[model samples]
Target: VRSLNSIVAVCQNMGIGKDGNLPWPPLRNEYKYFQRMTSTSHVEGKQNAVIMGKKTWFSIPEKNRPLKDRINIVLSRELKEAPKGAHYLSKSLDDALALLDSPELKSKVDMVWIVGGTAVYKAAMEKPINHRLFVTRILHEFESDTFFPEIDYKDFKLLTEYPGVPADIQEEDGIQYKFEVYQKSV
Candidate 1:
């Protein structure tokens, strides 16, 4: 797929994970929102791509890793071969950017999503490309050891937000949440 733009999910505190897993509870409707937002249908008929770090990939249960249908690209210095049914680019951040700049990437995909682990989101943030951020403002805070990088609100303006009961909105450990979208200002 051709590379177009990038989308990312970061936290208000810039936290990405805690001990290699989502620091927040799994919001079911948010998952559905993710699926709908990233699906091919929304990509103008082009194949979509998701770029993630090794830890993030591993954090996904074996059955869910290499998310089906879309292109799954993993960034890791260790994996020499792309896993069965997946693609691997064992490269540094610069190399990954170069790969994304290739003609083939530009032709096949409409957009590339940087699904975290802090390191990955940090790299994407450094790039000049415009990115759409899907942030879930869940009203709860947990003691976390890791986090998604903090985003400077001044750099991104709110584009749109919808209030609704997420398909899997559940109140556990005392928190309510809503989905929000922000776009990096041009």
Candidate 2:
């Protein structure tokens, strides 16, 4: 079976961002955690891939338009061609799966991470069972327009919680955060 997964860099209030930018101040440690957890090695040399929505892809700075090293699969109904350096552009989950299951990609990729804006995450949540790694910041709150959907505890079980170092928030608004991981469960 294809290994499907999700890696979300979210805040305590489930706010991923507001108006396309990261709502919270840069958390170097958290960013490091995201990199370490999603790297190729973490997926056992299988090509690491990120599935994101159109808005999320646009939010990335022009200089960083296409994330390097890992495959970028963008879900957009209007993309006619793959953006420079982007591995694939899909119109829907079915289209994304076709690319993910292609002979060239199947063997090289061990896990597919559904990274998101909001709709992408919602789509993943509706899919068959899969593992999800969520890095939730503690004591951090933001009035964001975008957010992750409410995860039903009945559908997922806690796998682990990695305690965070006492890192202070750089924002004028004091916000502290921690990290956690959850797995899909029956």
Candidate 3:
């Protein structure tokens, strides 16, 4: 009934960041899926939440701070303030989760989406709840420094496809990729 979703786009080697920027070609269709999933809400006024590591939050362009519709939460120890535009700056991922679950936010937060930077993704996957992983598998190889951590198959099982997500390979600019979701299964 509860879930923490970790989402990202990665090349074959699980690489995501290319020189501190999003990997090349910037698949137009791929990013659309991300925004939709994070922004989708089941309740009338309740919105989903997007959590980012301090690095991920700062890497965002100045104008796009908070990334629109969803609630933006950043996890960091150094930022004494909420970093100008983000709504919350919890010391850790767990703390942020608790905030979303608290009475004040419980009715306001529909889903918790984990946006990345290595350690945050790793920590989300390690959580014991019925969390999920929504990954965009970029088919082409790219030169990158930041990569998604190795996913342990034992804890997560991939679904053949998910609603509102593409099942067939998406191609654009001669690059091919697909959208997928994995759920933690006992």
Candidate 4:
């Protein structure tokens, strides 16, 4: 897979979501950061791939299902067809990576973004490959049942700074957050 990466927003306790939706109220700045990061493609005429679990795929609003300018690949084993506007459906993480090898997709896809549910994130992190983790650390705690997988710092180092990522903490709706990037050690 070309430049595999994962993006996630978590609360102080690493809580990501609850009841199939964001536990905290909308954070405009954080939302935009996510959009900008995943939509950005360094190679002209190429796009990024956002691979998401079925639950995460369904969590997105219908009208915005297939996030603009990015190829949406939904992971599912029971879905007979791609969700409304999703571009592809994969049975597993490996299946999704296989798409990157396809002649048609290889040239058009610049990166693969693992945007997920718990299982998906855990699976991606286990792969013995370098991965850039784009994480938005929410400063406050929230009531949530779903949480982000524990990241092994021994395998991924948090960068003090990263190009294209904001260097300062961002505040919105009385909540403070910061963008952090961790690159897996080779």
Candidate 5:
């Protein structure tokens, strides 16, 4: 199986949500990178897949379900039918990955990305091989209630240089941040 990657921005405390949701002011550049990275496709006429926690999809106002140019799979334990405003539903992270690997989409998907909400994020991180973390390390700190799980840097090596992602630290809205990618040992 191919790598199941992660895309997220974390503050000094490794948290995102302030009380309930992302409190930081809009950072269009980071989002654009996320959008562009997740949408990349290698197979001609095929698209990539982004698996997000079920509740994670409901909390966001935008992205409008399928999230444009990529196949969105919502993770949920309930709901035997298709999830609300979602294209597909999976019982677990593995189920979603399996769906992409299944014959129905196996030939159509060029890549897979695991977009997170903590629970799903931790699960994806537990995968031993072919994993890459595409993180936006925010230098500025914010009071956050929600936090990402512990990431073992020893297990994942940082790529000082990577295609299409900025290597230098970036400053926006009076805050400093940088795009980073870590590839876990296979």
Candidate 6:
């Protein structure tokens, strides 16, 4: 399998969403960091594939669907066809990965990024594959009904530094957060 990575932001209580939307105030720098991380491509002319659950797919504004310059794959058993802006649709995480295995897609996609809703995050963590987690740790808490899945530290070791990731804590819109990368231990 190709590189599979997950990116998410969570508060001190591990809350990720509230009423289907991000709970806390938007952090400008953190948003930029997410864009840079997922939009990057190692191979020229190739793009990354972002896999997200149906709900998460719809969470993005209609105008921003498909996320510029990247392939969007939505996982859903309910949907009969690919959503308006989604490039592909899969019933499960395995199916999504299998899609990337195609010779046609494999040559065009550089990385696989698992974007969220809780179930998708849990499924990605359960897969026994080498993967990385790019997490934005928010220092405060907010009322939220949805949360990020718990990660076992033994399976994924936190890295002190990673290329293309800022080393210091970032503050924006009065929210304090930090970028962290965790790689699955060999």
Give the best candidate by lDDT: 4
lDDT of each: 0.65, 0.72, 0.86, 0.91, 0.84, 0.90
RMSD in Å for all candidates = 3.9, 3.5, 1.3, 0.9, 1.5, 1.0
Residue 5 of candidate 1: its Cα lDDT? 38
Q: Residue-wise lDDT of candidate 1 within 103-136, one digit each (tens)?
A: 8775666667777667887777666667667666
TM-score of each: 0.78, 0.84, 0.96, 0.97, 0.93, 0.97
Better of 1 and 4 by TM-score: 4
Question: What tens-digit string does per-residue lDDT give for candidate 5 at 136-172?
Answer: 9899888888889888888988998998887889988
**Model 1: residue 32 alpha-carbon error in angstroms:** 1.1
The regions of model 1 sitting more than 4 angstroms off are: 1-14, 41-45, 160-174
- Which parts of model 2 are misplaced by more than 4 Å? 42-45, 161-174
| Residue range 38-141, candidate 6, lDDT tens digits | 99988998999999998888889999888999999999999999999999999999999998999989889988899898999999998989899999999898
Looking at model 6, residue 183 earns an lDDT score of 93
**Minimal lDDT window, size 10, model 3:** 23-32
Give the per-residue lDDT digits (tens) of candidate 3, residues 36-99: 8889988899898999988898888989888898889999988888998999999988898888
Write down the RMSD of candidate 2 (Cα, Å).
Answer: 3.5
Question: Between candidates 1 and 3, which one is better according to TM-score?
Answer: 3
Locate the minimum summed-lDDT window of 10 residues in model 1.
Answer: 1-10
What's the number of clashes in each of the models? 16, 2, 0, 0, 0, 0
| Candidate 4: residue 132 Cα off by (Å) | 0.4
Q: What does the lDDT come to for candidate 5? A: 0.84
lDDT, residue 83, candidate 4: 86
Clashing pairs in 4: none
